[PDB]
Amino acid sequence: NAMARKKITLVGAGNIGGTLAHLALIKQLGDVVLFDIAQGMPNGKALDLLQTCPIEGVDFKVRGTNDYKDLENSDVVIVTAGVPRGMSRDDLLGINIKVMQTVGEGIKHNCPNAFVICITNPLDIMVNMLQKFSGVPDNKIVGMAGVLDSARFRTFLADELNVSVQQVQAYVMGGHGDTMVPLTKMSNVAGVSLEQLVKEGKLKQERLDAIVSRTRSGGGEIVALLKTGSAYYAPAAAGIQMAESFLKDKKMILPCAAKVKAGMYGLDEDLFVGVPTEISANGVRPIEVEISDKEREQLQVSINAIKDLNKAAAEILA
Template identity: 55%
Template sequence: MRTKITIVGAGFVGSTLAQRLAERDYADVVMYDIVPNMPQGKALDMLQAGPVLGYDSLIVGTNDYADTANSDLVVITSGFPRKPGMSRDDLLRKNQEIVTQVVQEIIKYSPNCMLIVVTNPLDAMAQLAYHVSGFPRNRVVGMAGVLDTARFRTFIAQELNVSVRDVQAYVLGGHGDTMVPLARMCTVAGVPISQLLPAERIEQIIQRTRDGGAEIVNLLGTGSAYFAPSAAVLQMIDSIVLDKKMIMPCSAYLQGEYGIQNLFVGVPVKLGANGVEQIIELELTEDERALLQKSAAAVQELVKVMGI
């Protein structure tokens, strides 16, 4: 049987992800949204692209959670959209109610699924989904570090005029202003960027990475990024569904790793058929560890506000 993947929220991120998944042709896709007829229309449009692009994926749009039953993987993208001048933290109260309801409905119909959380503020919403679902920690993961790392790699590749494939990097911590790009571990074809760029320029690129989402929000005027976020989720799904066991930075529930207890924070993890199969502990410098702790504290503050 084909893998069944549900995407909750058929907006820009959700529908772009659905199209990317359809073109992978290894899963059937359900798009759920509260807007009547909208997910059905998008699904029909995608189905009709199948004969041209050569995929046989079944794509269903729905306003009924019953159609999501027995999903193997559920991606939560629904939530209040981020607007210019709005921080991710401003979204907390608005999206807490939405994500709580979504998770309650999803686990009713798919009690054995894995959850990938995309809704912002990302780490807090992943913590909320974990809390509401009661799932083991390997079955709940947040998409953040893959996207933040992609932005970091993009800016470095542009700066050095090299292929993005040759740039390797990690961005840890919460998805927001306190994220921790590990410049010390960033390499271009194996060469540390400290040998290729002055420290001042590296710091400017790090800051642009931290502001990556806001930069796009301000340019668009309405809405936020969706091409890169959907691509980042797709890479995570590839690794899970195809059991690739790729190591990538994701928001995972830590129980002592990196000195952080009972909190979702972005760290390198191994993603495979069982979800988060291993949390990779990097050797951090004192400064890097301090920045990660600061980032974790910012996430903890949001969790405290939510009362979970």
């Protein structure tokens, strides 16, 4: 019985979505469906992308759609849809919870066994909402966030230290910005921890602090530069990295927004939290690593922000 090609569906055909599509084709991960609510635009992007394929020697296809039925049989669904943020935090959540409702039902009704990667903001709460309305189990939904902060952090360290990105490992948990927890003892260059590099005078403590700080603010930095819109190349790269670990059963461990069970990281209740997460053919699984008292106090900031958003979201739903 002939084997079906892999099928990746991208819900949201903006710049991040088109970039996801392009990477999926180049890496030959499977057929691609580009979904967007906007008429014509997803088709136009699909067609353009499809026409790259003869140049690259690729026979996977890409098609545009405004219809949720076309999510059928998707192995992976990657969600970038939503409305960007003088709009209140209440109104923002309201509009996007709605969008997560629509996307979620689409998933529920058309590919309930898909692996679901959420990129929509605010990621802290949107990943929870998208599970809630799609009904997918804990191990089949994950949010992209840590991998981007880590890519940024690695980028900054590689340039500062003049070393390959392949020897730079940057570890984070928590959210973005002031909710990001940098794991500076475990982060290392070719096995030498960032704190050891300071102690050795190979890296100024000031430089390290500036790099951490620049990583916290990295999205905003690109926004200020772009004048219009936000980062999309690195975010897409992160999403595909994650998708690829699922599709190729790689068992990578990556900082992602994953539902963590009560007890792990001293949590009182199940919560989506940015934590090291295994990604395999079996979906995702959070990993508990030992962290310092300081890093844990910092993790508590994110947990408390997330709890606050969960409460606001509950109120909106009632």
